[model samples]
Target: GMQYIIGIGTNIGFTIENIHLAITALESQQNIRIIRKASLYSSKAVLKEDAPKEWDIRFLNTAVKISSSLKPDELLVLLKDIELKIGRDLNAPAWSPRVIDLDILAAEDLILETDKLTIPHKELINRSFALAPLLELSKGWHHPKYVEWDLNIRLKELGEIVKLKQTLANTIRMGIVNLSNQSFSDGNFDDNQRKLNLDELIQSGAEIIDIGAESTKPDAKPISIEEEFNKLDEFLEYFKSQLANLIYKPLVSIDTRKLEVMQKILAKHHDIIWMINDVECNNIEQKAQLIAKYNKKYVIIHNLGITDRNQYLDKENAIDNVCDYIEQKKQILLKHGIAQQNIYFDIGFGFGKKSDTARYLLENIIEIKRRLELKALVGHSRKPSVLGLAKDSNLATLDRATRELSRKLEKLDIDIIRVHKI
Candidate 1:
């Protein structure tokens, strides 16, 4: 009997469960005996484009040593067959997401290479994830041909990115904003400008885009709901006809607070809109009920109700108070049949809070994540903290500050970021 190392991986739903099932199925084969299995490591999808964007997926990868009497080619065929039995589509395009992926990493002293099978996967040498887990099973296992090189030393030489697992859990998922006015920021807001903005955002690596028909900038005049809908008319049609055809259709969040506008737009293009960026913090209980009923997602902001004519939240305990309010709101949501995962939180960076309070939240964001235990969103991009820090608050300075703030948020593992730039 020959010994072989098999790498088992999955990116589809219930990855760990599917890997266990695949191991069981392989053990049932008469020619194979599972000698040992490595621990599974969770990893983010390595590729950026040419992959499914709507579904943010993570991979569970492991390696197993098996004593099998079957030859290498025969073993390759067996692995493919097992994949099919476990519900993988052989006809799917290369790099398409999978339910189960099994590959022969090495086959004892065999050096055979052919079109259908490779004795050692060509990429195994550089795939840190595959090698790291393999080492857990057999510490002394080395390359078939390179008898003296230590896998541990090779791993460290590659770099830290290769050495550590990159799980996408709670990493600030960006929702890049392409448009915030009836006309483009520098010029007029028209179909051409909107199209250019959309194109820029597509290249911005944004998982989603926040499309606003009305500007929420300071000292902005209030527009009626009719006008907001009118401004959105052409862009809405453009998205449906053109942008939706893109391979990665970014989830869109409408920046409005009206139920009527939401209902009207949803009636035309159902389920394309993922969230409503409501600023009024309006009608929470009813909105939660409606959101749950329609099976859609929402972004809820922290708001301290108006105390007097002026509307600024308390300064000293802003972070603590906002965190408390979000928890209270979460309970209300749960009571209305809204799943905890469906609700997202915004720290309300510019929602009538003093600049000091805003900075406090930004500095102590980790505490908010700890307290809420919800994947929180912080929309501090280009707001007062950044602009106020510099003498000039133009797009250039604002973007620079936003980038700096983004770096801080990234360090703390903020859940989501709303930004004008990528």
Candidate 2:
């Protein structure tokens, strides 16, 4: 029997009060004395990729100290049960935001590991998230696991990352684009770069016009926001007009990564819905503020830049990788004060990732959703991903591909379907 300390973090569909409930439950058990916790902190989503524009996902993180007389073995079982009662799915991807994370950080200078548990929590000493918070409650608490050292020193060594939390609730909503590149399949438009037949596109089941100025295709040329906006002016205006008149249209998604273009479009039409993910801008905060300011929703895309392949680890396992990436990034979001519901994830199709990787994302969409317990938006519209899965169409006969893929997506219950040339 010995004293113990714990750390708590939750972003997936849970609240501070709920965490408190867990704490209360812990107290009801034997030999557990709840001592103190850090002044709960909230922070922004910490991420290393250029995500598509999306709702801010905020979270709440805290550190708790406990005194227990039970042996480390018994304590481990108690902790596991607590997670089960609180509904944590261990099968979830590593680092995905969770409803609650309770770890027995330390136990009176005791270090031990068994088949079911390990302590001083193999990672307890290595995370500022774990240290800085625990230090708040138990200062002067030296890590026997390490030689004598101050809590601050341990935090620095661990390389800290803050987590944020959203305190409210909202409805699940999203927008999509309408239109497709027919030149490749129908031979109706291509190289000519003709304006996609907008009316025809809507008829093809486009609920929104995802206006774009650049081609993100391989070896494609890039364009400026001004030029991009110039190309998009007609479409944007048409969408806006229909929106105001409440007549013709679907949601509008502006697929540009340029601040200038977003600023201009935002200035004139502050109400219509839109999304962005063509590129990652360092000034993402400005973009987020704009979303909060204008009251429009956007999609946060995966893949750091314009593609899915990172500098190394380039095997193309986006499903597993994104699963791991989002979990870690969720910690960053929680630290920064963004809410979870405000954010939506995108598996960028036809962007760097090969065909198998893309199809895998589609097949396992539910796994990602269930783990994070969050919804997602998928952009497979006329991508090599769909073609890869079916291998039945190319620029010439992709109609079958679109039809079959649409059925697959509809069955998978995919949220937003970004498409062109349907």
Candidate 3:
């Protein structure tokens, strides 16, 4: 078998999905086995002089190491076939925006150049977008012709590339760990129990862990900032210490509404907290400013109001109202210096809605995200809304129903799903 580094990239519609489709096509072919995949990266397009302005968009790129039995020319033909099947225009000019572009960056140490193909891609060294992912798949891999110069050194000279936290083509699971005793489900006040739960969540394949010191359930009493900060500080201290023992470090999200708590936590562990899951939109300007200052992601949830958790929006206007609220809050955050890409919205299911209304919101979540033009999270795990979907009220039934809904949400392409269980 021959080893090859294949770079997949797209700049046209749903770029990440395009890359995913191309990968799926490659995987379907016989005699090709993917060994490793690099993280998704975004880079500005390198356009030709005559390229149209519309072609100057960002591209999502990634590389995979595959062991294949096919020769270089045979692999090139297969890649072009995959691209064409994935909507790439075969006759399009070079450097034009494409649905998918697959190139063999390198093939072991065998150097090849032909009219239709080139091993150690002609532009690989010059393109950081390709080199970064290629190197990730095979670090220290060198050009057959330039074996002395380090590819890492070449990559640095080329430029920086932005790696995405999570690609839209994949759904992330965010495990919930609530310190508040008032949590409706899965709340544990015991320190040992919390640690056990955190361990279980990480081992259960959670990509993000949402730690909340306050309960956002209806009629739940608000905790003081000091108390909230204390809970988070202690848990985070233990979490940071356990990081090295874990196989993979999950993204930490401090779930809090208080600006002071957010400020204190981010100040102490700025690099640890990847997101601030703010349930209450109160003082968003200040919160946005703090999040921007720390350079973290912000979860913008839509509820009736902080004081109106018990209130419900009319089911008839629920989706529209939620979209409007999120739009306004998102614009506010962007104005306060938060990048548009750094925001993730939640419709606040069951926060300010009747079970049926919450169900309505969940049903339209994809539409809501589309209208807001943002990635979104659905926190419907074991909520009243999940129970409402089932005939039984037992915990087992609720768990089953929640898992069922999670499957549907995953199919809908939700960016993240917050769950009490795995």
Candidate 4:
């Protein structure tokens, strides 16, 4: 019988629950006795190449200790069985996404190597994911093979571990959405396109950059996950690189509906994203809960339906339609533990709103802001109302109207103005 420390990890589906499942299954076996466990860690899934097809993936890593009566090989077999019982397919390719992965780190003082198993994982010293929690549990135990140097000091050399700030100051904020659906100034300015698009945004006195992967335009075609991931990944990396040396950095946000994208973004560059704007409104509570848990800001949009143009068709009740819907959803988030100051409201102008509704919301923005007592984010750029009323259909006309609309928003103390031109 020996005490063995095992590293547990998963990159697919409800990771914390799956880790518990693995621990329960291991404890159920008569030969294995649970000892201690470390807190779960999150990190991006490591890949072999940067040019490979990118995916929305993240890993939940943790380490556990157990007393096992079986030999190392037998313990490995039991772990494999547990993984299989928990929906892991043995035929999956190496490094493929999985529901669970278990590795044996060390088996007390017993050092042995065989064709089937090794007592100590060969790469235990290199991975911070496993080492962080492993060192947290057994503080003074040095690695049997490499005990010459202080392991704690070595672990510190990995790099600085940083996390997103819990909450941002409550005040008026400005935001710009980089919607890649329609061409802005020229062709679609995407993540891969020249960095000039973002440079223009930075120069435009914009305070927040809301990055959207999929186009939410009414007539825009749907995009695949791979395509979306490729766009975001490229842009985020570029922004990170650019921000490293730049002094005036704007707050960044993700306008996404998928939790996978959020999880992946937070795992690696948690601090880069300051807010989330979910327009789909499919997973309201789920998204709200996540935002509350992370202490992050979120934009609540008042979307009536697939075609909201009819919902706000009334000229007189447009204010009530938009304000009432926002107030209701705002309460929904507050009820779910979201801080009042951490929430913002968006009238969802272009989703399906006609010119009348958009105009009403923009015209009476003061009443709406006062009603909620929270910051309002309005998108008035490139909308049908501004474009239709444009003189000779020039972009300058639209920009001027948007600028005028922006003046009203600023006068009303609206927090954020999402626009393409800016």
Cα error of candidate 3 at position 290, Å: 0.8
Tens digit of lDDT per residue, candidate 4, span 172-259?
2354545466633445654343366676665555556788877545577877766666667777888776653332356677887676
The lDDT per prediction is 0.70, 0.59, 0.80, 0.70
RMSD of 4: 14.6
TM-scores for every predicted model: 0.61, 0.49, 0.62, 0.54
Best by lDDT: 3
What is the alpha-carbon lDDT of model 3 when measured against the actual structure? 0.80
**Candidate 2 lDDT over residue span 27-90, tens digit each:** 7976788777565544443433654323124445676777777777777777778888888887
lDDT, candidate 1, residue 237? Answer: 73
By summed lDDT, the worst window of 10 consecutive residues in model 4 runs over 162-171
Model 2 root-mean-square deviation: 20.4
Off by over 4 Å in 1: 1-190, 243-247, 304-311, 386-392
Each prediction's RMSD over C-alphas, in Å, is: 9.8, 20.4, 13.4, 14.6
Question: Which of the two candidates, 3 or 4, achieves a greater TM-score against the reference?
Answer: 3
Tens-digit lDDT string for candidate 1 (99-193) = 89898887766777788887777777787667777777668877877778898888666532222122223353455443445355554543375
Model 3: residue 224 alpha-carbon error in angstroms: 1.5
- What's the C-alpha lDDT at position 182 in model 1? 34
